[PDB]
């Protein structure tokens, strides 16, 4: 597994002279990863099957404009705080803060103009690229100036994403990457034939608005028990589930820990995920309605892709029994997620 080489090129130009967007291509002998400076968006991810055939296993667009249209956060970095915040409101050190209600009745994925929709500054690395941006105080209702660095590196079939941040004032922070995967290749219609395993003992049941109830429910005897590989379609069926969109609680320390494994027997592709995060959002692309103009004439229907957003638990800022989500001045936010690609 070789260390990747990096190439860059102009990808697009933002309207209203918002700036030039570049595309960085990371390539090793095993994988090819494409990333743009707009929202640190992974745009393509090429991985081999058992025949040695490479398919891009990530949903996305061929042109910038694709991302600028109303699309569900494809392959981007999410923040300041990923997922939902009840009532778009939280308090920090006795001060109450209000955010944009971009998802009645809550606030979701950073607001109206979240981290996925801003231009990051890129710095090419020997085997990858680093994006950096300053989220000023008050950005999207959040207190504190947040300095963030998103670093993607590639070595063999392992893609590594690290998140670093520094706040000038206490603020919640929860960064992740919303890539939609499809191991049978981007163009397959569904993920039913995927085999999933999530090393989680508990999960977070949610409410009518999808905010966690506050309960840390055990997965035992439930359809949420993914500790043993299950075929997605069968499972959903056997359990009468429409799909998933839940945070699974990881057996967390801040140490690199196994998160989940996804296998696609027909191609033999395997995706293994490790993280330092306390949880993972496992969302089976339930909201795709097959109206998006994807890559290679691909349209993305419901269930065409799934996400594995490693993160801290949703609404943590309002749920004291949840892992701490506040970043205070002087400390450092630092989380890493490993996307290990392989063949079985
Ligand atoms: O379509 C974007 C999706 O992003 C997920 O992280 C979230 O939990 C889903 O409910 C939905 O908002």
């Amino acid at each position: 597994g070789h260390m990747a080489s990096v190439t860059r090129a102009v990808f697009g130009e933002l309207p209203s002279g918002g700036g030039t967007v570049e595309k960085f291509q990371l390539q090793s002998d095993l994988l090819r990863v494409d990333i743009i400076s707009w929202g640190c968006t992974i745009t393509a991810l090429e991985v081999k099957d058992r025949q040695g055939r490479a398919s891009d296993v990530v949903l996305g667009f061929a042109e910038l404009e694709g991302y600028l249209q109303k699309q569900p956060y494809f392959g981007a970095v999410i923040g300041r705080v990923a997922n939902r915040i009840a009532k778009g409101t939280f308090k920090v050190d006795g001060k109450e803060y209000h955010l944009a209600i971009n998802k009645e009745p809550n606030s979701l994925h950073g607001g109206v103009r979240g981290f996925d929709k801003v231009l990051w500054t890129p710095r090419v690395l020997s085997n990858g690229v680093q994006f950096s941006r300053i989220s000023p105080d008050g950005e999207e209702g959040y207190p504190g100036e947040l300095k963030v660095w998103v670093t993607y590196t590639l070595d063999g079939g392992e893609l590594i994403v690290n998140y670093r941040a520094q706040a000038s004032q206490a603020t919640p922070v929860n960064l992740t990457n919303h890539s939609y995967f499809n191991l049978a290749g981007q163009a397959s219609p569904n993920i039913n034939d995927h085999e999933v395993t999530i090393e989680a003992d508990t999960y977070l049941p949610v409410d009518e608005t999808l905010i966690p109830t506050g309960e840390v429910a055990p997965v035992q005897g439930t359809a949420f028990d993914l500790r043993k590989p299950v075929e997605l379609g069968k499972h959903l069926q056997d359990f009468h589930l429409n799909g998933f969109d839940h945070n699974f609680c990881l057996k967390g320390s801040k140490e690199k820990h196994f998160c989940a494994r996804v296998h696609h027997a027909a191609s033999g592709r395997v995706l293994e995920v490790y993280t330092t995060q306390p949880g993972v959002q496992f969302y089976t692309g339930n909201f795709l309605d097959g109206t998006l103009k994807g890559k290679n004439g691909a349209v993305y229907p419901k269930h065409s892709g799934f996400c594995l957003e490693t993160q801290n638990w949703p609404d943590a800022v309002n749920q004291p029994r949840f892992p701490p989500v506040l970043l205070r001045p002087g400390e450092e936010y630092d989380h890493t997620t490993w996307f290990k690609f392989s063949v079985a």
Side-chain angles (χ1 to χ4, degrees), residues 262-281:
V262 188
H263 179 239
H264 175 251
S267 72
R269 297 191 171 97
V270 168
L271 160 54
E272 293 169 309
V273 184
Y274 300 79
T275 185
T276 60
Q277 298 275 200
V280 59
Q281 193 79 359

Side-chain angles (χ1 to χ4, degrees), residues 72-73 83-84 108-109 178 180 210 245 281 283 287 309:
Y73 305 96
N83 208 279
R84 294 167 182 85
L108 165 76
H109 289 331
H178 213 290
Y180 291 61
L210 306 185
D245 189 358
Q281 193 79 359
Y283 165 67
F287 292 105
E309 312 166 61

Side-chain angles (χ1 to χ4, degrees), residues 15-87:
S16 281
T20 296
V21 169
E22 295 167 87
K23 172 157 263 194
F24 303 82
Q25 152 181 324
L26 319 216
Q27 194 162 241
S28 73
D29 49 329
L30 302 171
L31 297 188
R32 191 184 93 190
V33 194
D34 283 349
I35 309 165
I36 68 181
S37 54
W38 171 261
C40 315
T41 307
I42 297 192
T43 250
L45 212 169
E46 281 179 31
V47 191
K48 277 146 145 105
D49 54 21
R50 352 153 138 86
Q51 285 181 111
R53 309 216 117 81
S55 325
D56 178 10
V57 297
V58 104
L59 309 215
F61 310 105
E63 293 99 45
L64 188 58
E65 294 73 84
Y67 288 99
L68 313 176
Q69 88 208 344
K70 170 198 223 213
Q71 48 93 14
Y73 305 96
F74 278 68
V77 160
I78 293 139
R80 209 176 282 206
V81 174
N83 208 279
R84 294 167 182 85
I85 268 117
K87 298 178 169 185

Side-chain angles (χ1 to χ4, degrees), residues 203-207 211-217 313-315 319-322:
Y203 87 92
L204 292 193
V206 307
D207 72 15
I211 294 296
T213 65
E215 192 198 357
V216 187
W313 311 352
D315 204 36
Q319 243 127 168
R321 259 158 265 139
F322 285 11

Side-chain angles (χ1 to χ4, degrees), residues 28 35 40 48 81 130 132 139 145 149 152-153 167-169 183 190 195 210 215 218 229 271 300 324 333-334:
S28 73
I35 309 165
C40 315
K48 277 146 145 105
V81 174
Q130 168 177 97
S132 74
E139 188 175 87
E145 174 171 281
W149 293 271
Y152 295 90
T153 54
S168 66
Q169 247 194 273
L183 302 188
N190 73 94
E195 206 164 5
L210 306 185
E215 192 198 357
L271 160 54
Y300 304 127
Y333 180 100
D334 178 30

Side-chain angles (χ1 to χ4, degrees), residues 167-335:
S168 66
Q169 247 194 273
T171 182
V173 176
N174 188 18
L175 308 174
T176 192
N177 178 294
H178 213 290
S179 292
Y180 291 61
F181 299 97
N182 189 331
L183 302 188
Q186 165 221 239
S188 342
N190 73 94
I191 63 162
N192 298 335
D193 49 355
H194 280 50
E195 206 164 5
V196 181
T197 305
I198 303 179
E199 192 139 75
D201 276 352
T202 54
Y203 87 92
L204 292 193
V206 307
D207 72 15
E208 55 282 345
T209 48
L210 306 185
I211 294 296
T213 65
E215 192 198 357
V216 187
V219 313
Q220 266 278 170
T222 77
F224 294 88
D225 182 6
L226 310 173
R227 308 161 289 184
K228 287 183 291 188
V230 310
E231 196 203 303
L232 200 52
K234 210 234 184 236
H235 195 81
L236 291 178
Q237 193 176 236
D238 302 349
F239 285 79
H240 309 301
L241 282 178
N242 181 243
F244 302 93
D245 189 358
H246 295 77
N247 174 81
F248 293 73
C249 299
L250 299 179
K251 206 174 142 172
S253 81
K254 331 77 228 147
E255 315 268 326
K256 173 208 238 213
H257 42 272
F258 174 79
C259 172
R261 180 178 297 91
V262 188
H263 179 239
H264 175 251
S267 72
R269 297 191 171 97
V270 168
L271 160 54
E272 293 169 309
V273 184
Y274 300 79
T275 185
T276 60
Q277 298 275 200
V280 59
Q281 193 79 359
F282 176 37
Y283 165 67
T284 51
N286 312 318
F287 292 105
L288 297 159
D289 54 15
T291 65
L292 283 174
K293 3 190 156 129
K295 272 170 296 181
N296 290 341
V299 64
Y300 304 127
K302 177 158 149 177
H303 301 354
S304 57
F306 61 86
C307 314
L308 281 165
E309 312 166 61
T310 55
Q311 58 180 23
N312 189 342
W313 311 352
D315 204 36
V317 83
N318 294 320
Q319 243 127 168
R321 259 158 265 139
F322 285 11
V325 66
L326 284 183
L327 179 61
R328 289 195 179 280
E331 26 186 47
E332 186 157 275
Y333 180 100
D334 178 30
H335 273 293

